[PDB]
Scaffold this active site. Structure first.
Site, short mmCIF file in Angstrom:
data_model
loop_
_atom_site.label_atom_id
_atom_site.label_comp_id
_atom_site.label_asym_id
_atom_site.label_seq_id
_atom_site.Cartn_x
_atom_site.Cartn_y
_atom_site.Cartn_z
N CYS A 169 -9.86 24.99 -2.43
CA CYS A 169 -10.64 24.57 -1.28
C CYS A 169 -12.01 25.24 -1.22
CB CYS A 169 -9.88 24.85 0.01
SG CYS A 169 -10.77 24.36 1.51
N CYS A 190 -13.98 25.37 1.46
CA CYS A 190 -14.43 25.63 2.83
C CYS A 190 -14.80 27.09 3.06
CB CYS A 190 -13.41 25.13 3.86
SG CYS A 190 -12.12 26.30 4.36
N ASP A 197 -12.22 5.07 21.08
CA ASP A 197 -11.12 4.17 21.38
C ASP A 197 -11.31 3.61 22.79
OD1 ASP A 197 -7.47 4.35 20.83
OD2 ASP A 197 -8.87 2.67 21.04
N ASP A 218 -8.36 8.09 11.64
CA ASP A 218 -8.48 9.19 12.58
C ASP A 218 -7.09 9.71 12.83
OD1 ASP A 218 -7.88 6.77 14.55
OD2 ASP A 218 -7.41 8.61 15.64
N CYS A 270 -11.83 29.59 3.30
CA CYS A 270 -11.22 29.96 2.03
C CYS A 270 -12.15 30.81 1.16
CB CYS A 270 -10.73 28.72 1.29
SG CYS A 270 -9.33 27.94 2.13
N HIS A 280 -10.46 24.99 8.25
CA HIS A 280 -9.91 24.71 6.94
C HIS A 280 -9.25 23.33 6.88
CE1 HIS A 280 -7.61 24.75 3.29
NE2 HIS A 280 -6.58 24.39 4.05
C1 LIG Z 1 7.27 7.64 18.72
O1 LIG Z 1 5.89 7.67 18.40
C2 LIG Z 1 5.45 8.20 17.11
O2 LIG Z 1 6.28 8.47 16.26
C3 LIG Z 1 4.00 8.41 16.83
C4 LIG Z 1 3.58 8.48 15.50
C5 LIG Z 1 2.24 8.67 15.22
C6 LIG Z 1 1.31 8.77 16.25
C7 LIG Z 1 -0.14 8.98 15.89
C8 LIG Z 1 -1.08 8.02 16.63
N1 LIG Z 1 -0.94 6.62 16.25
C9 LIG Z 1 -1.69 5.66 16.86
N2 LIG Z 1 -2.80 5.91 17.58
C10 LIG Z 1 -3.23 4.69 18.00
C11 LIG Z 1 -4.32 4.31 18.78
C12 LIG Z 1 -4.51 2.96 19.09
N3 LIG Z 1 -5.55 2.54 19.84
C13 LIG Z 1 -5.70 1.25 20.19
N4 LIG Z 1 -6.75 0.89 20.95
N5 LIG Z 1 -4.85 0.29 19.76
C14 LIG Z 1 -3.80 0.59 18.98
O3 LIG Z 1 -3.02 -0.31 18.59
C15 LIG Z 1 -3.60 2.01 18.61
C16 LIG Z 1 -2.51 2.39 17.83
C17 LIG Z 1 -2.32 3.73 17.53
N6 LIG Z 1 -1.36 4.37 16.80
C18 LIG Z 1 1.73 8.70 17.57
C19 LIG Z 1 3.08 8.51 17.86
ZN LIG Z 2 -10.22 26.02 3.06
#
Ligand SMILES: COC(=O)c1ccc(CCNc2nc3cc4nc(N)[nH]c(=O)c4cc3[nH]2)cc1
Ligand SMILES: [Zn+2]
Ligand SMILES: COC(=O)c1ccc(CCNc2nc3cc4nc(N)[nH]c(=O)c4cc3[nH]2)cc1
Ligand SMILES: [Zn+2]
EC number: 2.4.2.29
Lengths: 369, 369
Positions: free
Chosen positions: A304, A306, A92, A266, A309, A335
């Site tokens: 599973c 793995c 990222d 991811d 398991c 796991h």
């Molecule tokens: C209040 O916040 C929450 O509820 C909440 C929910 C899920 C995640 C998991 C992670 N989600 C996520 N990771 C991220 C990583 C990202 N990287 C770039 N460069 N650009 C993006 O636009 C981007 C968006 C994302 N969204 C994180 C926070």
């Molecule tokens: Zn397993």
């Protein structure tokens, strides 16, 4: 052998399965990338990450530029050599983590200045850091618009990201070794707004990238809304390149996103929740700390494949996690990552065989029973 | 195949090398036993413990009787099955840990009552717990005399331990399955006093055990004093049975103890110090957190044959430990246990070849340079 070649082997509705060939290996899609933010997938040796079925892992420009440092990693031979993972790594760009984790930030057209201790990120600096790390898939430097956002704020944010996408493209192309050996993905923004998503897709396609991420989601909007946005957003991206949903997600999120045309994922969930005692199973998640598992001789999941398991009981892992033992975190994490990879394998096989719709239905009926 | 057979293959001065054959495997001596107090050698899978060269590990009656419980472990199939280690396990009897770790204790001729929550240990209960665990080498239930102690207090303490040794012998012999499949070791006490050590050795030999531990040392007396006591104490034990020094120790402690006739060792140092950033090397211990290692591409030790030293640099491990990463603890621990096993292998080979005196000299000159 090739720098980057995406081939779609089979389709079912919007779902696709295929391969990305890169110099360091083949990535089977749809793909799940374990997260290795601090140059380690937490509690796993790289050989164990590979044994679970992972083809590629994720690293982070933001974390590594601070510790141990990008120039330092390059001096030590690059991220692959440093951590002992010789297969592809996607990094990222820092665009999201700088705003999520920094104590203070100043945003401008140039980029973002932040306190970790004062540092800067910009499209050019992000691409250079990813070059120093030796990333195989380089992400454009973007801005993940906060949620919710007004249409006008979403628009100005997305437009800045598109200008930054062009600067990312130019910086990457200027570095011959990077352009010859790595790939560059653009990131679509636009919040939840169809017209802005379209404008963003148009801008990215005009510039041209090796792959296209859907950014700005998994930011608190919830599954219904995320799916609604994916419904219109993914078809806007070039069909012939991979589609990467950043930061997603739970198993059902992954299945529904694949139904909507996503090829790459991811998430920290399997690793983080593993350490916290949550194990994924085909019958839904369980918390291994629960007293009901104290004398349960069954493995974490009955099907599973793995190594965990094959060898250890729920009762033993329950004991380890309640005792705060490192081996508990190791076994739970192995796991969970293996479960995620088996999910991806089942998705790939079912799409290949034209029975993914049935798989999704069967998966949900059992997982949420 | 045999229950317990000790064979001495070679000698040099007081040092011996050989094998203990037991039903679950062969133990090469002098032997180092990694400590697995909570039914895990911290941060290592059992397969990794074996890969480092360990033939036997140590468990603890005190810890396991509290968590997860002895009857529970037996219901789950025994300690071996529970933790996935199929080779010999030696269990301490609780005699030391009950006094070291309990918040409140009451001592009497019957045994020790303690708060972890109220429990009891006695020779009979200790032997039964070790039976339920399925221990291969069972330790007599004893009292580790505090240091320092007056001669009279040391004497009364040692005498109680000898009465408890006979009760341990009787309890073990009454349990047919245990007597047929496991071995029982007695524990010499007597503090630092030659006459009491002699009386203790005499009492234990009269009862008769499969092996003899030197108890009551590594309790704050320091190496000079420990060696002084070993000088007269070990020759008091039967020559034809193994000699086990409980709770020792640092590499130089082990070498000097072998020079004085010790065959078996256990210590938390390699595991605990590994997690804390201390790595053992042939040039002495290093602390990997030190800034001097931040760009050091060499392995932890230049000669070490372990998997960690084949693959990862000091720089990477430095980064992991400073970041608080679980993989840091895993790699440091694997290396340290492997180092200890390589030390034992060098000791065994040098005694076999009649050059152990030279090895001890060379080892010290380099380790303390
Ligand atoms: C209040 O916040 C929450 O509820 C909440 C929910 C899920 C995640 C998991 C992670 N989600 C996520 N990771 C991220 C990583 C990202 N990287 C770039 N460069 N650009 C993006 O636009 C981007 C968006 C994302 N969204 C994180 C926070
Ligand atoms: Zn397993
Ligand atoms: C102030 O205290 C210290 O300096 C210090 C030094 C070394 C150790 C390492 C552990 N040493 C050790 N473990 C031991 C375990 C033991 N178990 C039984 N059943 N009987 C003993 O007689 C005994 C003695 C021990 N000595 C522990 C404490
Ligand atoms: Zn090593």
């Amino acid at each position: 052998r090739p720098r980057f070649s995406f081939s779609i082997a089979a389709r079912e509705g919007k779902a696709r399965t295929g391969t990305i060939e890169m110099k360091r290996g083949v990535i089977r899609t749809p793909a799940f990338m374990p997260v290795g933010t601090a140059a380690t997938v937490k509690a796993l040796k790289p050989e164990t990450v590979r044994a679970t079925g992972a083809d590629i892992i994720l690293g982070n420009t933001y974390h590594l530029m601070l510790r141990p440092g990008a120039e330092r990693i390059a001096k030590l031979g690059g991220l692959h050599s440093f951590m002992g993972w010789d297969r592809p790594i996607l990094t990222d760009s820092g665009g999201y983590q700088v705003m999520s984790l920094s104590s203070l930030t100043k945003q401008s057209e140039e980029g973002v200045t932040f306190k970790s201790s004062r540092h800067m990120l910009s499209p050019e600096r992000s691409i250079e850091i990813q070059h120093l790390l030796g990333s195989d898939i380089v992400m454009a430097f973007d801005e993940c618009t906060p949620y919710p956002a007004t249409p006008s704020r979403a628009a100005s944010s997305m437009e800045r990201s598109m200008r930054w996408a062009k600067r990312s493209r130019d910086a990457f192309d200027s570095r011959k070794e990077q352009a010859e050996n790595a790939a560059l993905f653009g990131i679509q923004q636009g919040s939840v707004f169809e017209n802005l998503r379209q404008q963003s897709a148009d801008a990215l396609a005009e510039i041209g990238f090796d792959g296209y991420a859907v950014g700005g989601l998994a930011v608190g909007e919830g599954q219904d809304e995320m799916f609604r946005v994916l419904d219109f957003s993914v078809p806007m991206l070039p069909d012939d390149k991979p589609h990467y949903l950043m930061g997603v997600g739970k198993p059902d999120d992954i299945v529904g996103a694949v139904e909507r045309g996503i090829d790459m994922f991811d998430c920290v969930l399997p690793t983080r929740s593993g350490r916290n005692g949550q194990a994924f199973t085909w019958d839904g998640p369980i918390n291994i700390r629960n007293a009901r598992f104290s004398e349960d001789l069954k493995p974490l999941d009955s099907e599973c494949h793995c190594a965990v398991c094959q060898k250890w009981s729920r009762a033993y892992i329950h004991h380890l996690i309640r005792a705060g033992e490192i081996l508990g975190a190791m076994l739970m994490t192995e796991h969970n990552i293996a479960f995620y990879q088996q999910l991806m394998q089942k998705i790939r096989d079912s799409i290949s065989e034209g029975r993914f719709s049935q798989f999704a239905q069967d998966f949900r009926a059992r997982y949420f029973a």
